[PDB]
Amino acid sequence: TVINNWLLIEGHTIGIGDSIADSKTYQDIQNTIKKAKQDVIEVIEKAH
Amino acid sequence: VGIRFCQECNNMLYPKEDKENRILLYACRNCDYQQEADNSCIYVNKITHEVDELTQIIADVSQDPTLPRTEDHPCQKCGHKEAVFFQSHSARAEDAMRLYYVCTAPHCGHRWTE
Ligand SMILES: [Zn+2]
Ligand SMILES: [Zn+2]
């Protein structure tokens, strides 16, 4: 009861803003993914 | 290693021992036909089964649009730049991820492995 009625004051939500990261973070993630794909390509070529 | 067929009833031949001359013979069991044996071997069993896949690879495979192709590896016969490559394409191939290359361009049909 008391916590719900305090949440009536503070409030909680979810939305687009909660799912969006900084552009630097997106660039870092893309760099990591590209590096991973390059490593997988290298492994495939080594197996070839 | 292979089998040879009878020359009279066109049946299957079987190995038969010649007691007198001690020479290997293939004698059909459905008639009296007998022929001399040249290879002198009967049963060959390759447990490792290391048969070169290049013989089992068909030249027309190069016609496949779904197959990857590379410009890096040229043909050895005609030196054609374009070549199509694919993996073993077979089961029970032990552990082998090696690539088999087939040269494109008509009438070449060359297959090599690197
Ligand atoms: Zn026969
Ligand atoms: Zn060629």
Curated annotation (Swiss-Prot), chain A:
It is found in: Nucleus; Cytoplasm; Chromosome. The tandem heptapeptide repeats in the C-terminal domain (CTD) can be highly phosphorylated. The phosphorylation activates Pol II. Phosphorylation occurs mainly at residues 'Ser-2' and 'Ser-5' of the heptapeptide repeat and is mediated, at least, by CDK7 and CDK9. POLR2A associated with DNA is specifically phosphorylated at 'Ser-5' of the CTD by CDK7, promoting transcription initiation by triggering dissociation from DNA. Phosphorylated at 'Ser-2', Ser-5' and 'Ser-7' of the CTD by CDK9 (P-TEFb complex), promoting transcription elongation. It comes from the Eukaryota. It is linked to Neurodevelopmental disorder with hypotonia and variable intellectual and behavioral abnormalities: An autosomal dominant neurodevelopmental disorder characterized by profound infantile-onset hypotonia, developmental delay with poor speech, delayed walking, and impaired intellectual development. Additional variable features include feeding difficulties, dysmorphic features, and visual defects. Catalytic core component of RNA polymerase II (Pol II), a DNA-dependent RNA polymerase which synthesizes mRNA precursors and many functional non-coding RNAs using the four ribonucleoside triphosphates as substrates. Pol II-mediated transcription cycle proceeds through transcription initiation, transcription elongation and transcription termination stages. RNA-dependent RNA polymerase that catalyzes the extension of a non-coding RNA (ncRNA) at the 3'-end using the four ribonucleoside triphosphates as substrates. An internal ncRNA sequence near the 3'-end serves as a template in a single-round Pol II-mediated RNA polymerization reaction. May decrease the stability of ncRNAs that repress Pol II-mediated gene transcription. Component of the RNA polymerase II (Pol II) core complex consisting of 12 subunits: a ten-subunit catalytic core composed of POLR2A/RPB1, POLR2B/RPB2, POLR2C/RPB3, POLR2I/RPB9, POLR2J/RPB11, POLR2E/RPABC1, POLR2F/RPABC2, POLR2H/RPABC3, POLR2K/RPABC4 and POLR2L/RPABC5 and a mobile stalk composed of two subunits POLR2D/RPB4 and POLR2G/RPB7, protruding from the core and functioning primarily in transcription initiation. Part of Pol II(G) complex, in which Pol II core associates with an additional subunit POLR2M; unlike conventional Pol II, Pol II(G) functions as a transcriptional repressor. Belongs to the RNA polymerase beta' chain family. This is DNA-directed RNA polymerase II subunit RPB1. It comes from Homo sapiens (Human). The gene is POLR2A. The chain holds residues 674 to 721 of 1970 of the full protein.
Curated annotation (Swiss-Prot), chain B:
It comes from the Eukaryota. Its main location: nucleus. GO terms for biological process: maintenance of transcriptional fidelity during transcription elongation by RNA polymerase II; transcription by RNA polymerase II; transcription initiation at RNA polymerase II promoter; transcription-coupled nucleotide-excision repair. InterPro entries: DNA-dir_RNA_pol-M_15_CS, Rpa12/Rpb9/Rpc10/TFS, Zn_ribbon_RPB9, Zn_ribbon_RPB9_C, Znf_TFIIS. Gene3D superfamilies: 2.20.25.10. Component of the RNA polymerase II (Pol II) core complex consisting of 12 subunits: a ten-subunit catalytic core composed of POLR2A/RPB1, POLR2B/RPB2, POLR2C/RPB3, POLR2I/RPB9, POLR2J/RPB11, POLR2E/RPABC1, POLR2F/RPABC2, POLR2H/RPABC3, POLR2K/RPABC4 and POLR2L/RPABC5 and a mobile stalk composed of two subunits POLR2D/RPB4 and POLR2G/RPB7, protruding from the core and functioning primarily in transcription initiation. Part of Pol II(G) complex, in which Pol II core associates with an additional subunit POLR2M; unlike conventional Pol II, Pol II(G) functions as a transcriptional repressor. It is found in: Nucleus, Nucleolus. Transmembrane segments: none annotated. SUPFAM superfamilies: Zinc beta-ribbon. Keywords: Acetylation, DNA-directed RNA polymerase, Metal-binding, Nucleus, Transcription, Zinc, Zinc-finger. Belongs to the archaeal RpoM/eukaryotic RPA12/RPB9/RPC11 RNA polymerase family. GO terms for cellular component: nucleolus; nucleoplasm; nucleus; RNA polymerase II, core complex. A zinc finger (TFIIS-type) spans 71-113. Pfam families: Zn_ribbon_RPB9, Zn_ribbon_TFIIS. Zn(2+) 2 binds at C75, C78, C103, C108. Core component of RNA polymerase II (Pol II), a DNA-dependent RNA polymerase which synthesizes mRNA precursors and many functional non-coding RNAs using the four ribonucleoside triphosphates as substrates. Pol II is the central component of the basal RNA polymerase II transcription machinery. It is composed of mobile elements that move relative to each other. POLR2I/RPB9 is part of the upper jaw surrounding the central large cleft and thought to grab the incoming DNA template. PANTHER family: DNA-DIRECTED RNA POLYMERASE, DNA-DIRECTED RNA POLYMERASE II SUBUNIT RPB9. PROSITE patterns: RNA_POL_M_15KD, ZF_TFIIS_1, ZF_TFIIS_2. Zn(2+) 1 binds at C6, C9, C28, C31. This is DNA-directed RNA polymerase II subunit RPB9. GO terms for molecular function: DNA-directed RNA polymerase activity; nucleic acid binding; zinc ion binding. The lineage of its organism: Eukaryota, Metazoa, Chordata, Craniata, Vertebrata. A zinc finger (C4-type) spans 6-31. SMART domains: RPOL9, ZnF_C2C2.
